[PDB]
């Protein structure tokens, strides 16, 4: 007769990925043109 309970991690070093990793599809996304708001910042700084 054996009766006990255990809980184990998903060892995220090995497993834990295999997902979408929402970094991508957003880092390759507008991060450049949104950064390009340097144009507007320069505009406001000129009149500042």
């Amino acid at each position: 007769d054996i009766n006990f309970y255990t809980r184990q991690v998903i060892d995220p070093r090995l497993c834990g990925g295999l997902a979408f990793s929402p970094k991508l599809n957003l880092f390759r996304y507008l991060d450049a043109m949104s950064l390009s708001w340097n144009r507007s910042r320069l505009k406001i700084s000129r009149a500042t």
Partner: protein, 145 residues
């Protein structure tokens, strides 16, 4: 039991963090062994007739001591003896079966403990479906930004 505390549990919960930790129960493993008879040899024998009424009256009509099987014939197994047996003189001893201790049993079990890759992949896919739903819903936000 091997419990692990996460420190300021409630504080981290309010901060907005999900927490996991390995855990073990105070389980028990038992091994019980029951001895049995071990026949080694036999030789003497004898034939007994005595009585053959061990069985019940299934398939017979009961009328007092009469076991009616047909409308005109019956038998009384108290005296209806037609089965002959044999009885021998067996030689037997007490044999004690043996088994591994629960210590090494649990050691082997915990060594064999391995997560289910198929279940892991299926659950990851199940989560990723709704993850994609929300990502597709939210995709327009940085455009407004």
């Amino acid at each position: 039991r091997r419990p692990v505390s996460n420190g300021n549990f409630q504080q981290r919960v309010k901060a907005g963090d999900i927490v996991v930790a390995p855990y073990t129960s105070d389980g028990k493993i038992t091994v019980k062994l029951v001895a049995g008879q071990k026949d080694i040899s036999s030789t003497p024998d004898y034939d007994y007739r005595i009585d053959s009424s061990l069985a019940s009256s299934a398939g017979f009509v009961v009328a007092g001591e009469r076991w009616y099987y047909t409308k005109r014939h019956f038998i009384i197994p108290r005296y209806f003896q037609n089965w002959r047996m044999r009885r021998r003189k067996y030689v037997t001893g007490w044999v004690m079966p043996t088994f591994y201790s629960p210590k090494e049993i649990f050691n082997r079990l915990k060594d064999s403990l391995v997560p289910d890759t198929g279940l892991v992949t299926q659950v990851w896919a199940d989560n990723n479906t709704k993850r994609m739903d929300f990502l597709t819903a939210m995709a327009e936000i940085p455009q407004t930004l």
